[PDB]
Design a protein around this nucleic acid. Structure first.
Ligand code: MG
Ligand code: MG
Ligand code: MG
Ligand code: MG
Ligand code: MG
Ligand code: MG
Ligand code: ZN
Ligand code: ZN
Lengths: 488, 488, 488, 488
RNA sequence: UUUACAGUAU
RNA sequence: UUUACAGUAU
RNA sequence: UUUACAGUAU
RNA sequence: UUUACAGUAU
């Protein structure tokens, strides 16, 4: 029955566990955004940067891996439709910010347009081209009055001009202090570290509609206060209240299950059905099942599914392409209701999203900007049994596979023996079910020994086949082979 | 450099392994379709069928699980835009064929329109509505001449009218024999079993362009011959030749690697880049990476990628929705080249496909009809570490997770102890890194014992938390707990 | 340099661990006897006893297992060189004490001569035949003065006659209370439970030379006091002192290593060499090695070895036969020095010992009475790898063994298959090194399948061979066999 | 019912398995001696030997380990009651034979008295002091007639003087060839390798009472013949017969179970009871249990037990001291019957034995000369769970043990953390049952972290405790510790 | 294997 | 496999 | 623990 | 976060 406005919106900060600081936005008991931080974020850090290798170009900002820099992102003041081999010389030093953190193998997006975020404004020092209103918001007037050689945040709504000036200045101080520690050293160095998860919250998530800001630990709270004030949000001060229940905070507000759902592949919807979220090389793919009038059911579920998808998108910090497979509905009107629901349900999201109509296949494609790395990238690792595939090849299939591999290697001229080192049950199978087979191979391709040793240090999909050439063979024992061959 | 026509197209039948009979269509050494059969296929089997429960309706054709029957698929002669609660009464007997085998939880598609496949025709006894030309093909004339109260196959091209009559008859005999063993027994029984993999090949894949039909085993070959003749394909007889190389057949024709590619998640393309195939609840998703002029590269790779996708679609018997993420190309002309390539490259496919333009997201959606079950369904099983997800949740994350679960259970009124039974390293972590935590819980929620026993019979994601109520507790030993609790 | 008398003898009671109460007699820092008790001793308990089955006779004193009763141990008053089939009728009730606890399979020694231990006397109510002096000790006179229709303890030395009377009485009270709860119920019941480890100490180990009695816990201490007083040892009261060091008691007195030595197979001697204690079905066997004048060395070491053996005998509570293999010495005089040393070194032992001369083989046999069960019986369990033997049969030996077993079973008429289920490396070996072998068997003894499945749930010595008769065979998978056969 | 003489005595040679050549002496179907050889024996090999270090003295005869040489065993001709520092100078070369192979840590007995074994004589070239009759046997006369500057075997009984001369010569040839390849090279070299297991048999075990010599393989048989002839035993030739049953040789003669008994700890006796053989640092110890007139039973069993012990002594090649614990018998006459039985039953044994009367403890000590290494030394290895002890310390005991160790290490000044790395269930126990304990330690001995990580790469008795000093600590994870510490 | 050697010592 | 069918629904 | 008991026997 | 940016490229 969720209607925005009915209940309070609190920001719950849970800081009783050293190893995972947690910030929830909750509306009533509905978790609608989560942020965790563990002893950490590198986005928005600024660096003195030396160009590595134009081939836009790559960079050494000090990290184990160089960063990526787009021609689009080079500056006017840093430029001594042209080719980059023109504006920037190798080894050339330049001020650099991180737009996108390191994902998989990519370095990072860096930009020489540098942006500075405060409570109410965002200085764009390195560019006048971009600046103006929060597409979300008397201020066009208050804006002009300001000095400069920038943008106003969704949070200036309830404030005057001095405050913007108060902000605008502090920003500048930074900018100055910024290009000063830049004119004062070698090139490959960190200049500015982004604020931590609590600051960021206070800076970026404090709409006027945030009722309270609860906190489960005193030390932090205190830290919290100083953070507000220093942050120019004096008003909120009264709002920060220390929680002291025996029952844990996120638990009292009944949001831990919801936090967990961020981690499941399936997520149950209100009326019963569910969504399954599956990630893949290319894209994330969400699918949708009904629970128990048909046409109705399909509609209603898809509607729930939209709302949920919208928040899962956020909790799991999901970025890039996303392909949703809504239940199929005949009435075109339904198809629009549903896309609309979706658009509606993602309006609060801070990330740029782009949605799109249900295809004739019943698929809906969308895209959501990478704000930060996702759950799965940052709190999961690739299942090391299957190596991402989520399946394991049945035993025979694999065995017969291996058998063939064995004969092939047996065929090569100059072969003395072949050692197949393999999961136990494979060995069982090759050495019973397929005994004759292996025999045949051995009688046929002649004086070639086929060793197939079982090995409990292996599970099925993994195995090795080695080929031992006439000459190189030893008097080793079958079961001693795995260790002998441990260097491979 | 593959140009259709250059080289011979042989059908390689590999039957030297009892447990996996293998039929390859190869063009030169290019594998372009594979069929494996293991001591098996249920599609096209016919049954006497008793209606279970109208709610189209479900069926008992004898299998552990009832089958699905669409109103669309009920007959005129079996009907004693209306509702099914009208045409078919519960328990009612009716002739039934399988359109689609059992997938996951679904029963099967059954149809009371029954189709009978021979070399040149397909009798549609139970319906005159559908019949006519192979959209792939003097015969419109040869067709009419026939008796009846049906369709002509892509293979009638090189034959006369008597042969169609010769076929047409044999079909009818069957039809008769069909509804006779149907009028002669109870209802829940198998009537017709589909032919095996070799017959099916000969029946369905012998275009005039098939040069030879090689075979690696004598017994089968002989069987093969009788299969041709009985199949009314006398011409091919001369074409069936027994292979006798020491080197295995599929190996001599260098197609085993290609057969294997059907099983990898990544598949390298000619010029270097690759495609990654990822399956998911909803759909399969193929992604495409370049290897090393940009615009060129992207184009050329996407082109290779199309060809490959087309054959992988076939080797892996992939069905349903498929979403391809081609490398992104600016020139719209390229986007059409690529979709076209794809269409071209899938023309030979026997399954109905539907393709579609590259979306503004760079995605291409397509659909390919389920002919049979896919590799992954039929020769893989769900990785039992991760349970499909392809990831495992990092240790702390999981632990902290468990910790919270523990406190929560500790809170419930009437609790005496809580036993967390968990992977070893979780236990390590909860009992060192998080010792104080667990302590706190215990001192706080009072005289409540928190047992956290490590267990080597578990890997990380799996765990148990049990709650032992005041009264129900025992004097068991920490490490004895897992077994005590083995009934859960 | 240990001379008895030099340093204090304290009794250290260590009771800071709920699960193991520990009482050490230490002389200086030399541990010279240890007693542990864990939440326990059954010796000296008294029972109402019903005769089970004359065949002396067995008994039901209530325990899961009946007890053993010697004709020698039946009474005059309980007797309604004769045969027991005479004195005691089946089911006959009689008062019963435990002389020896349950060892391995034996029930227990029970006696109808019942003995009652107090600080200074031992009432022998059920017999006047035995009574008199502690062979270890004015009292022959003090003894007579007493009433009666009994023995004086080694501890009466420093006391008068009233105290013996004070003791003598309390004893009698018990005796009376004893045969009263005996005349007041069915037969199969416990009558008297022996005191706990602390009481027993105070009762049985408090010679006048015990300086202090330290204790590491207050609650127990207090309990301790009441135990002394109730025990009629008022004098010692001043002697009981509570220990309060941060450093653990047994640790401060540097005796924990020595306590541990009770648990090693090897035990280093002062001058360097060592003794190895090995227990066996029959007897314990101690062996003795020198460390680095020969004749000297041998002598001196054997001498150390004697002292040590004497205390190990005690710490490990070793009973029954013991065979020591001293280093060999030519000079007969040495052989006597050494036996004597031994006799000397075991004089303090409370158990009856019998020693004996070094045999011509250099062996010394001795015997030491079972006071209680030994370390190894009470804090060890039979190594479950080797099953007592302390060796594992090398792999080939075992394999070849199994191979032969396999052929044999293959030979039996009416055999269809033989399944060898075996440790992995055995399987490796049988299925590579011995492949031809297994082959031969199979080609020879005909159409008989030899399945040899590796199994990681087994280590080498354990294995199974099953024989599957014509008829009883299944289509199971090689590696599925272990589970199929798990009922055996 | 075994009476020597009733049945044939055959020598069964089983040589159908490359990896274990087997020679059985069987009387009827009673195995009464076994010899196995695997692709091997070093006793009786001769070497050129360089003295390493007088301290008799040690030697380098080429083996990884030097050999032991007794003053008693130096020669007259090699001597340039005195001290060895006199007769033999360091580095001095001398002819050397192996009396006793390498056992455990000992090198080997070597002797400069060299003995040469043929069918009928034994040349003692390097000494005239020793020579004469087989204490087991017209020949005193035949002996004298011989030339020389030696002993007659138990096998000369049925032969003349020429044969002794024929032998005597061949021996000499060897002797000459011996000291020639000795005068013709450096010092550290092998001179003579002892014959293999089949030769040795034929040479040493062919009494006239050996009926047949069966053989299960043709190639070997043939080899066998040439071995006889070359061995001067022409008579036996007719006796060597090739076995050709499908049923394996040792199996047909029903002796495989008996061969196996050589490997069990328990061995059932005819009438039911059994003997348990237990080996130990010092000595082997045999114990004896009855099965179901008492006095009778005890006697009869002990008698069986004697016979069995006698043959087990042989099958298991048992050497050194042996202590038998016969069932106890009152009648002294019985005690002599039994010792006598034993003496009788070991008369055939080739090794020197010395027996002795039953002690007052009921123990019988005996000694049997090491002919070769024993089963357990040569086909077993030390159980690696328990490390010889045959027991494992119960869990708590071990844990509490570890706990104490932990506190102790916590106490040392300059300690930052202590890591206990331990079998899983220990960790369970220390971290539940003993949680407070570990807590206490930590609160008490202050800011000292006690890490106790469970580890599945360990079983209970093994564990590690490390102490990490202020300074040397890291930010490693609890469960990452075992690997971090894997270098220890 | 013979007034011996067997145990035993490295 | 033919104004079809392919996806889709259990 | 005392002309004893200790080993030993189930 | 403002005719933008979001996807996308390493
Ligand atoms: Mg769906
Ligand atoms: Mg996946
Ligand atoms: Mg891509
Ligand atoms: Mg010794
Ligand atoms: Mg042992
Ligand atoms: Mg015994
Ligand atoms: Zn997985
Ligand atoms: Zn063991």
């Amino acid at each position: 029955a969720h209607i925005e406005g009915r209940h309070m919106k609190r920001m719950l900060i849970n800081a009783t566990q050293q190893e995972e600081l947690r910030v929830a936005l909750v509306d009533g008991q509905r978790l609608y955004d989560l942020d965790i931080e563990s002893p950490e974020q590198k986005k928005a850090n600024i660096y003195k940067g030396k160009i590595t290798r134009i081939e836009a170009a790559f960079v050494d900002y000090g990290a184990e891996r160089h960063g990526f820099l787009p021609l689009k992102e080079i500056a006017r003041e840093y430029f001594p439709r042209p080719n980059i081999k023109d504006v920037l010389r190798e080894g050339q030093e330049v001020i650099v910010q991180i737009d996108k953190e390191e994902r998989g193998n990519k370095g990072a997006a860096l930009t020489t347009f540098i942006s500075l975020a405060g409570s109410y404004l965002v200085l764009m020092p390195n560019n006048p081209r971009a600046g103006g209103i929060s597409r979300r918001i008397e201020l066009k007037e208050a804006l002009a009055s300001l000095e400069l050689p920038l943008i106003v945040r969704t949070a200036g709504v309830g404030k005057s001009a001095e405050a913007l000036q108060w902000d605008l200045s502090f920003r500048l101080k930074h900018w100055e202090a910024i290009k000063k520690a830049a004119e004062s050293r070698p090139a490959p160095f960190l200049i500015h570290q982004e604020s931590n998860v609590i600051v960021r919250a206070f800076r970026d998530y404090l709409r006027q509609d945030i009722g309270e800001i609860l906190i489960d630990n005193p030390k932090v709270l205190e830290l919290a206060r100083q953070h507000i004030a220093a942050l120019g949000r004096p008003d909120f001060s009264s709002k920060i209240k220390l929680y002291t229940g025996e029952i844990p905070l996120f638990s009292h507000y009944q949001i831990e299950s919801q936090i967990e759902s961020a981690f499941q592949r399936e997520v149950r919807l209100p009326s019963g059905g569910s969504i399954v979220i599956d990630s893949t090389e290319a894209l994330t793919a969400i699918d949708i099942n009904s629970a128990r009038d048909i046409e109705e059911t399909a509609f209603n579920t898809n509607l729930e599914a939209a709302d949920e998808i919208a928040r899962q998108l956020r909790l799991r910090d999901l970025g890039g392409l996303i392909v949703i497979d809504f239940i199929d509905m005949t009435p075109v009107r339904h198809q629009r209701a549903v896309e609309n629901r979706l658009r509606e349900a993602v309006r609060q999201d801070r990330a740029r999203i782009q949605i799109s109509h249900i295809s004739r296949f019943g698929l809906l494609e969308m895209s959501r900007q990478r704000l930060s790395p996702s759950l799965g990238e940052s709190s999961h690792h690739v299942c090391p049994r299957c190596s991402g595939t989520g399946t394991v090849r049945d035993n025979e299939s694999l065995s017969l596979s291996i058998l063939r591999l064995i004969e092939e290697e047996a065929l090569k001229e100059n072969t003395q023996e072949v050692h197949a080192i393999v999961p136990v049950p494979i060995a069982s199978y090759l050495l019973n079910e397929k005994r004759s087979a292996v025999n045949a191979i051995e009688t046929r391709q002649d004086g070639v020994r086929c060793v197939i040793v079982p090995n409990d240090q292996m599970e099925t999909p993994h195995y090795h086949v080695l080929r031992v050439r006439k000459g190189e063979e030893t008097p080793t024992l079958s079961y001693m082979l795995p260790k002998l061959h441990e260097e491979a």
